[PDB]
Amino acid sequence: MLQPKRTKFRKMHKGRNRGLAQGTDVSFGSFGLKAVGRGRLTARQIEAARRAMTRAVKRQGKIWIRVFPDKPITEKPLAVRMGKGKGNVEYWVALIQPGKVLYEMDGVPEELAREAFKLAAAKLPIKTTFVTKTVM
Amino acid sequence: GIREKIKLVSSAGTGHFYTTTKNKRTKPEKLELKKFDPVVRQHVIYKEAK
Amino acid sequence: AKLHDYYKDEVVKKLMTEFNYNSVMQVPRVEKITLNMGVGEAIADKKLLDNAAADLAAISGQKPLITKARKSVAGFKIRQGYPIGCKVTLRGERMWEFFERLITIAVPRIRDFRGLSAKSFDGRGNYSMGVREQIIFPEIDYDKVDRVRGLDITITTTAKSDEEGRALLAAFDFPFRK
Amino acid sequence: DKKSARIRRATRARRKLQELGATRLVVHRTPRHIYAQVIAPNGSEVLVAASTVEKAIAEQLKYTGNKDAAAAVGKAVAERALEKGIKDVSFDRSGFQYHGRVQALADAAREAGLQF
Amino acid sequence: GGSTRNGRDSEAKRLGVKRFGGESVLAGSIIVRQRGTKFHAGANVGCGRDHTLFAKADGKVKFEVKGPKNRKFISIEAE
Amino acid sequence: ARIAGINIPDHKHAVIALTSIYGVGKTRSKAILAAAGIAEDVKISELSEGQIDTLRDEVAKFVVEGDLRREISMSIKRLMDLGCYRGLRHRRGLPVRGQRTKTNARTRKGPRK
RNA sequence: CGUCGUAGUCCGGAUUGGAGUCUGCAACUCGACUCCAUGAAGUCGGAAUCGCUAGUAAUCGUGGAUCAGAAUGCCACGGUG
RNA sequence: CGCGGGGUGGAGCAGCCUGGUAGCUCGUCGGGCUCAUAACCCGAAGGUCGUCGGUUCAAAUCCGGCCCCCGCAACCA
RNA sequence: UCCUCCUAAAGAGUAACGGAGGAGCACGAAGGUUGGCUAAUCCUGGUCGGACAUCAGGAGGUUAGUGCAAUGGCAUAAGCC
């Protein structure tokens, strides 16, 4: 399961997304995904999406992932009132925007991300899909 | 800082006594440095403290 | 004290009559020995070197001086300003004066005497002539029982390669091995 | 680079002289030569100098790196200083020691006239 | 957690800025804890215990572009 | 003056610091002392410069210390490569004195604090 | 008589290779004797305790048995006491 | 809630605070006393000093984390 | 109560039980000043040497250090002789 390295500081700030940022050129492979939308992505979502692909791709590839959790989130008991204060770290998250490629592939010809992505898109936010390699 | 004050004596007639707070926790030796006083204005020799 | 006369007459210099060198600035030259004598575990004695203070100047033509440490706490015990050795460095005439006892009369103790191995050679032809421990030379009051310490000697050259630094081993004879 | 250490000592001096501006006397020496030059109050050019290159010294001195040759330049730059009336002149030693040939030059410059 | 404090009241800002009046002495730059990023050049110097490049003569600032790469000096103008 | 001894004691007979150490043996190393004018009964001090030149003359006749230990060590290291009985017993810490490790192997074992 | 100390010693030479010498299918492994060389341990010794009344304790040599080929163990002998 | 301690060859705790540095009484095995085991006197072996790191020339101690325990304890809409 | 870096908005003080930490002292020397010096770390090799040991060479450097904290700077050294 995905559990990122302990942060230098005990807690972090969540931060705002600009909802664009180009990152469409594949550099760990030759093809990937289309994002075309904006939102928040969690560690459990990218591990559940990895599970969906791991079950369909068996051991071929591997597949490289350009999204990784960036922040831990603070969580506390539900009954604590509004005011004081921030709890301990629980789940880890990242931000996604239209120019992201998310996942990068090359060693998996025609059995992943070439005809459909529906089975992995069902685990994710922003109704994602596959992309074809950019050559010109 | 929380250290003992002891004033140096002049070897001659002088209206001032220079106040020392010299640490004596590793240095038992005496302090002799010369100071200025605005009366005779030819420097004063100060002795015997801590 | 005669090497100073011969090193100026032909030793690695008559070479210049058959090889393409217009000055001694392209030929091998020897002018330095950066001597040292270590104290080792002397901090657990602290009384013998307190009286053997000129015992390195007994073999070197310069003024004795105790070297002070550059380390204040160590896993072998040291203290700030503790004396850690003695140098009594050889250059020029005192280096040629000192070299006249090396290999010629330094034979009271041996460990190979056929050339050992070319350590610290620097790719130039830097030659070993050390004795590991002092062997005692004839001067004054040298026949008695007296203690001896660690002594190692390398003769370093201005040559550019051991192909040309070896012109010294073509002017003198000493046992050599690579 | 032991040559650069002399230049560092000159950077120290050049920075220290920069707040003075004004007329400046620079002394420079080498193992065979010595010279001294007076720099203008705008810093952009020389006014007068003395150097062991002149046949007035170089034909009379048996070696130009000598003490008496440093004194010959000191006694010439002091003589040319009196010709151009220079006062409030700040001294500069080009990263060298003052002791030795720069002192032996200065000692004779204050023998040919005013201090210096 | 908490107790990170930082404390209260500190400034040392905006005094080394724009056109000067050229008739009293000026700080030139009051940037905090200066040891080599700026320094002084030309006829002026500043060696104060609070790292101020305060000029000791009356004049205006040059806002000079000379000096090696990212090291630029506090200097007074000729007028 | 000394020729083969390295220990500190002074003014002894010409055998204790002259023979039976590091490689010099005792069989030919003592016959040379009469040519140097040195007596072998009762403590003596006649070995100095001059006398010792008669002893510094002996060259290439014997070997001492690490080069004599090299001679035996290589003469066992050639066997430690092989399946020989003394090969493994010098590759591993095992006795060769025909010992009973039930009773006495004390030199090969050690303390016995 | 000569010689020597409070030093793991003049010593010791226990250990480790290389040569040999003997007996014997055979001594590699488990045998003895020898030589040139190398080289370590031992300077009273755990809680605690052992034994007899004079040629006894204490201590040094000599012999035999076993045996193709070795004992320091086994059985005996005398000197000093 | 919140507060204050403990974690030390196998067991249970001194040690720490005061820096020049790994232990005691038992335990385990083997002895000594004995016909023998206990009582009792000796001999021997083994510490991630919970444990990951930090800090320092330098610790188990300085000190953050990740766990395991106890004592006061829930004495407020 | 005091103090740094940041939040704090390319003009300034600055909020919320905001973010990383400290200060109630230290040093008569660790202060003044002249001239110098230049790390660190690692590799090489040198009896007594468990193990870091010496002096010299090579690579190499706003990377060593700065009384203490966080921060900015560093040979014109504010770092040490």
Range of the domain at A47: 21-136
The full DSSP string for chain D is: -HHHHHHHHHHHHHHHHTTT-S-EEEEEEETTEEEEEEEPTTSSSEEEEEETTSHHHHTT-S-TTSHHHHHHHHHHHHHHHHHHT--SPEEE-TTS-STTHHHHHHHHHTTSSS--
Give me the residues paired with residue D51 across strands: D35
C78 φ, ψ to 5°? -145, 165
Contacts of E24 (CB under 8 A, 6+ apart): E58
Contacts of A17 (CB under 8 A, 6+ apart): A38, A39, A40, A95, A96, A97
Where do breaks (C to N over 2.5 Å) occur in chain A, by preceding residue number?
none
Distance CA C89, CA C57 (A): 10
Three-state DSSP state, C154: strand
State CA A127 to chain mean position distance: 13
Q: What is the CA radius of gyration of chain F?
A: 20
Answer yes or no: are the C-beta atoms of D57 and D35 closer than 8 Å: no
Report yes or no on A9 lying in a domain: no
SS (H, E, C) B4-44: CCEECEECCCCCCCCEECCCCCCCCCCCCCCECCCCCCCCE
Distance CA F62, CA F26 (A): 12
Neighbours of D96 (CB within 10 A): 17
Distance CA C143, CA F48 (A): 6
Answer yes or no: are the C-beta atoms of F30 and F55 closer than 8 Å: no
Distance CA C123, CA C125 (A): 6
Q: What is the DSSP letter of A64?
A: E
Of the candidates C38, C33, C8, C21, the one whose C-alpha atom is nearest the C-alpha of residue C160 is C21
E43 chain-D contacts, CB cut-off 8 A: 19, 21
F81 φ, ψ to 5°? -80, -20
Q: Is F87's CB less than 7 Å from nucleic acid strand G?
A: no
Distance CA C86, CA C55 (A): 9
Q: Into how many domains does chain A fold?
A: 1
The full DSSP string for A83-115 is: SS---EEEEEEEEE-TT---EEESSSTTTSSSS
**Pairing label, strands D24-30, C154-155:** unpaired
**Pairing label, strands B19-20, B6-7:** antiparallel
Tell me the CA distances in angstroms from A117 to A58, A114, E2, one per residue in order. Answer: 16, 8, 47
CATH number of D54's domain: 3.30.420.100
Tell me the CA distances in angstroms from A101 to A119, B14, B27, C97, one per residue in order. Answer: 17, 87, 71, 79
Answer yes or no: are the C-beta atoms of F90 and F73 closer than 8 Å: no
At position F82, the amino acid (one-letter code) is L
Closest residue of chain E to D21, computed from CA coordinates: E43
Three-state DSSP state, C66: strand
Where do breaks (C to N over 2.5 Å) occur in chain C, by preceding residue number?
none
Token couple for E25: 């002495």
Answer yes or no: are the C-beta atoms of C106 and C136 closer than 8 Å: no
Of the candidates D22, D17, D15, D20, the one whose C-alpha atom is nearest the C-alpha of residue D42 is D22
Q: From start to end of C19-130, where are the E strands?
A: 32-33, 37-38, 66-68, 83-86, 90-91, 127-128
Q: Is residue E31 less than 8 Å (CB to CB) from chain D?
A: no
Distance CA C134, CA C109 (A): 9
Three-state DSSP state, A69: coil
Q: Is C73's CB less than 7 Å from nucleic acid strand H?
A: yes
> In E1-79, where does DSSP find H-type helix?
none
Contacts of C122 (CB under 8 A, 6+ apart): C156
Give me the residues paired with residue A72 across strands: A92
Report yes or no on A7 lying in a domain: no
Domain-wise residue ranges, chain C: 3-172
The H or E element containing residue C132 is strand C132-133
Three-state DSSP state, A49: helix
Distance CA F86, CA F92 (A): 10
Q: Is the peptide bond before C144 cis (omega within 30 degrees of 0)?
A: no
D→E contacts (Cβ < 8 Å), by residue, are 18-19, 21
D2 φ, ψ to 5°? -65, -25
Q: Which long-range contacts (CB under 8 A, 24 or more apart) does A14-18 make?
A: A14/A71, A14/A73, A14/A93, A15/A71, A15/A95, A17/A95, A17/A96, A17/A97, A18/A97
Nearest to F10 among C111, C145, C147 (CB): C145
Q: What is the DSSP letter of A120?
A: H
- In terms of residues, how long is chain B? 50
A41 φ, ψ to 5°? -120, 130
Distance CA F90, CA F82 (A): 11
> In C49-146, where does DSSP find H-type helix?
92-99
Contacts of E51 (CB under 8 A, 6+ apart): E31, E32, E33, E34, E35
Range of the domain at D75: 1-116
Closest nucleotide (C1' vs CA) to A86 is I17
Q: How far is the CA of F20 from the C1' of G37 (A)?
A: 9
Three-state DSSP state, A45: helix
Distance CA A116, CA A132 (A): 11
Three-state DSSP state, C72: coil
Three-state DSSP state, A118: helix
D19 chain-E contacts, CB cut-off 8 A: 40, 42-45
Q: Which nucleotides of I are covered by protein (CB under 7 A)?
A: 1-7, 11-15, 17-22, 24-29, 35-38, 40, 44-49, 51-57, 62, 71-78
Q: Is the peptide bond before F112 cis (omega within 30 degrees of 0)?
A: yes
Three-state DSSP state, A121: helix
**Pairing label, strands D24-30, D90-92:** parallel
Report yes or no on A13 lying in a domain: no
Answer yes or no: are the C-beta atoms of F56 and F36 closer than 8 Å: no
Q: What is the greatest pairwise CA distance in chain A?
A: 57
F1 chain-C contacts, CB cut-off 8 A: 142-143
State CA D81 to chain mean position distance: 12
Q: Based on the number of CB atoms within 10 Å of its own CB, is C81 exposed (0-12), middle (13-18) or buried (19 or more)?
A: exposed
Which residue is associated with the tokens 């002088």?
B14
Elucidation technique? cryo-EM
Answer yes or no: are the C-beta atoms of A77 and A36 closer than 8 Å: no
Token couple for F67: 């080069």
Q: Is C111 in Cβ contact with F66 (below 8 Å)?
A: yes
Q: Is F56 in Cβ contact with C107 (below 8 Å)?
A: yes
Q: What is the DSSP letter of A32?
A: E
Give me the residues paired with residue D48 across strands: D38
**Pairing label, strands A31-34, C90-91:** unpaired
Q: What is the DSSP letter of C16?
A: G
Q: Is residue C73 less than 8 Å (CB to CB) from chain F?
A: no
**What is the nearest CA distance from C108 to chain F, expressed in angstroms?**
7
Contacts of F12 (CB under 8 A, 6+ apart): F43
Q: Is C111 in Cβ contact with F65 (below 8 Å)?
A: yes
C154 φ, ψ to 5°? -120, 130
Token couple for D96: 């060298």
Contacts of C51 (CB under 8 A, 6+ apart): none
Rama region for F45: left / alpha / beta (φ>0; ψ in -120 to 50; rest)? alpha
The H or E element containing residue F107 is helix F106-109
Of the candidates F20, F47, F69, F55, the one whose C-alpha atom is nearest the C-alpha of residue C109 is F55
Token couple for D45: 């050019």
Distance CA C28, CA C14 (A): 12
**Pairing label, strands C32-33, C90-91:** antiparallel
Give me the residues paired with residue D29 across strands: D34
Distance CA F83, CA F92 (A): 12
CATH number of A54's domain: 3.90.1170.10
Of the candidates D78, D84, D93, D86, the one whose C-alpha atom is nearest the C-alpha of residue D23 is D86
Distance CA C43, CA C77 (A): 7
Answer yes or no: are the C-beta atoms of C153 and C129 closer than 8 Å: yes
Q: What is the greatest pairwise CA distance in chain E?
A: 58
Answer yes or no: are the C-beta atoms of D80 and D48 closer than 8 Å: yes
**Pairing label, strands C37-38, C83-86:** antiparallel
Distance CA A25, CA A136 (A): 12
> In C19-165, where does DSSP find H-type helix?
92-99, 162-165
Three-state DSSP state, F90: helix
Distance CA D21, CA D88 (A): 11
Answer yes or no: are the C-beta atoms of C144 and C32 closer than 8 Å: no
For the domain C3-172, what is the CATH code?
3.30.1440.10
The full DSSP string for F50-88 is: TGGGGTTT--SS---THHHHHHHHHHHHHHHTTT-HHHH
> In C33-175, where does DSSP find H-type helix?
92-99, 162-165
Report yes or no on A116 lying in a domain: yes
Q: Into how many domains does chain D fold?
A: 1
Token couple for D113: 């006239």
E63 φ, ψ to 5°? 50, 50
Which residue is associated with the tokens 């620097």?
C122
Which residue is associated with the tokens 């002026």?
E44
Token couple for E42: 């030309």
Token couple for D107: 């000692």
Give me the residues paired with residue A124 across strands: none
**Angle of helix D101-109 versus helix D67-84 axis, rounded to 10:** 40
Distance CA B45, CA B18 (A): 10
Distance CA C145, CA F9 (A): 8
Token couple for C56: 């390195």
